Design a protein around this ligand. Structure first.
Ligand SMILES: Nc1ncnc2c1ncn2[C@@H]1O[C@H](COP(=O)(O)OP(=O)(O)NP(=O)(O)O)[C@@H](O)[C@H]1O
Ligand SMILES: Nc1ncnc2c1ncn2[C@@H]1O[C@H](COP(=O)(O)OP(=O)(O)NP(=O)(O)O)[C@@H](O)[C@H]1O
Lengths: 373, 373
């Protein structure tokens, strides 16, 4: 049926797509849609199609730079660019559909929890005035369904941070200034905007990256005002911390997870020509981030305990918690542990995530398994 | 022609093999042979065939253990096992062919340099007495064509260390005691043999691993006397040092190179329950091993210099140096730099190895390349 709606754009190559990704599904309240698992033609990974008119493009990759002074000079030759806070949460695309506000996560999933929560952060008025518009933003905070951590200054459950506004079908991105007005017009919370800079501002930008890193914050995104040039640069902190987080589940992750972030550290250290004791300090922190969580996980598997973590979320409607478990099932494996209704306007829900692979590999290994490399 | 000689063992699946590995070639002195690049049937990777009678089986993988107390218990339930020095050099298989002594490296390559040198370490008498036998051993030292380092106690160019004796066609391995007698009968230098131990000796084995590690040595191989049970265990030092060596060419190596050895450290640390300051010390050493060479390689590419290393070997016959360059070409890319004839009975030859990939990736990156993860 939506196979015709797809034809309104591409061919029987839709059939070639039916092979392994780019699939059908119903929504938070039974709103059937097609999610592009893999990217075909001009429709990116994570692209959602509800109908010919409502086509929410996938959020593109954002290129990364490893050296800050270059890369900046390379990309923003002599132009001027905005520097925004890169917030560590999860990517959310927000649309209004038949009066319903929707939260589309990166993969192209209409997510129950997000969907339920967006209204708290985005006024309905916006879409009433702007049907043709999508909001893109980071959902971030201590009580998050996905990421373990977030910005240290968000004290209670999730918060929403806008960083893009796009029109539908096209997915074309509105100018920075335009998006900032929207944000202020409608009172939508927005990623911090540190200012407009040039390649000539690399020194004070170093200073910024320094502060953010001392504060345990992710890093920055650089944007041309016409939203055509976009690059990410993460802090030393993000790199070491990502390693600390992931070392606890070492065997749940591809080796590249670790080496990539080792790179990014080396390059930082090279670029700032850090040496002597400051270098030692960083080396030691790389060591501990790699070893301690790993070793603690080993002691754990050894005490016959499982590798797990408990994380919390707040909901309006308890049945959406259950809806999450099913949504998670479309990916990982989580179970409920405690409901504290003792929350105004809802319930704090504690989930449990298990890490079978991490637990099994460590198990076998400490069990004395012999293997080939 | 040798296609019939292969048929004396397998079928027209030899043709299926002709696809991508298991190939023909001539030797150090034009002795044509077939090298098994990939393993088919009962003939392993690196298996050499000179003719139906002379079939040098490939050296098998040696299984690894990551936890010492277990693994030992798992493999040598209550049995008794020999503990040999694991010597960091390169794997060599030695045969006598029509009066010629041959050095077959792991991959199945008749190696000019090794071939030229074996006579210095293995008496001809041996093969005169034992035509049906192969010697397997580690070639190791400061002036090595392959590995960068070796045992710290080998002061001048390469040395040979026996660790297996096998009969031909079968490749069946002789008992430990039998190989030790051979070693002593013919004066072939052998890997240090620390003793016979049981699972009940883990404590003094820990002490051994401790000393070896403080001495910057690889580790140990454990062998049942009938050579049927074989397992490797490397020192903390080997793990950290392997990281230090590889970090300098970080991008020349698969991420797994680094993570695997991070694991092995974690497990060591867990097993010995190392904590407090001793833990800190190891964490710092992991950090420096991962960062400092990397950073120095970055400063280097940046000073427009190339990532390279100079390594030396000694030869009897100068034309075998050239022969090496061609043999290397069958794999990597090396050039000659200096000949010091000023060596009794030959020449000390300085080679140069380049690392294009490491140099190019670092180049682009410090040049500010923007990329996707
Ligand atoms: N101010 C911001 N502007 C744009 N994106 C932001 C901002 N703050 C946080 N982000 C998020 O940071 C993401 C890009 O950073 P990162 O998480 O490293 O990439 P990723 O999620 O791994 N996928 P990709 O960008 O395709 O490599 C975006 O996809 C957003 O979800
Ligand atoms: N005492 C010894 N007994 C057996 N092998 C030894 C000994 N000392 C050194 N070796 C060498 O050490 C190797 C085994 O250790 P390692 O270097 O981890 O193997 P590898 O090169 O990874 N190949 P594989 O064993 O197939 O995984 C053997 O291939 C030998 O070349």
């Amino acid at each position: 049926k939506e196979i015709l709606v797809k034809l309104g754009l591409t061919e029987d190559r839709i059939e070639t797509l039916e092979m392994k990704g780019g699939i059908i599904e119903d929504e938070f309240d039974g709103i059937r849609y097609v999610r592009f698992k893999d990217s075909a033609g001009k429709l990116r990974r994570g692209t959602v199609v509800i109908d010919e008119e409502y086509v929410i493009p996938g959020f593109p990759h954002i290129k990364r730079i490893i050296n800050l002074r270059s890369g900046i000079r390379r990309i923003f030759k002599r132009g001027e660019f905005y520097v925004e806070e890169k917030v560590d949460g999860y990517n959310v695309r927000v649309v209004m559909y038949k009066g319903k506000m929707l939260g589309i996560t990166r993969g192209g999933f209409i997510c129950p929890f997000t969907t339920e929560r967006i209204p708290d952060f985005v006024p309905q008025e916006f879409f009433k005035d702007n049907p043709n518009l999508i909001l893109v933003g980071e959902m971030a905070g201590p009580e998050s369904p996905y990421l373990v951590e977030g910005p240290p200054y968000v004290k209670e459950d999730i918060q929403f941070f806008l960083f893009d506004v796009q029109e539908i079908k096209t997915g074309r991105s509105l100018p920075v200034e335009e998006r900032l007005k929207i944000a202020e017009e409608y009172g939508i919370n927005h990623v911090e905007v540190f200012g407009k800079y040039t390649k000539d501002d690399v020194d004070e930008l170093y200073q910024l990256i320094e502060r953010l890193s001392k504060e345990g914050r992710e890093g920055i995104i650089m944007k041309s005002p016409d939203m055509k040039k976009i690059v990410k640069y993460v802090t030393p902190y993000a790199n070491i911390n990502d390693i600390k987080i992931g070392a606890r589940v070492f065997y749940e992750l591809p080796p590249g997870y670790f080496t990539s972030r080792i790179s990014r550290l080396a390059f930082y250290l090279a670029e700032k020509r850090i040496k002597g004791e400051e270098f030692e300090r960083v080396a030691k922190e790389l060591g501990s981030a790699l070893l301690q969580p790993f070793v603690e996980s080993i002691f754990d598997v050894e005490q016959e305990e499982d590798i797990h973590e408990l994380f919390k979320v707040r909901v309006k409607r308890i049945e959406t918690a259950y809806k999450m478990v099913t949504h998670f099932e479309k990916l990982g494996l989580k179970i409920e542990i405690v409901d504290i209704e003792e929350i105004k306007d809802g319930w704090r829900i504690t989930f449990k995530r298990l890490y079978p692979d991490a637990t099994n590999e460590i198990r076998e290994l400490i069990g004395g398994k012999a293997f080939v490399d």
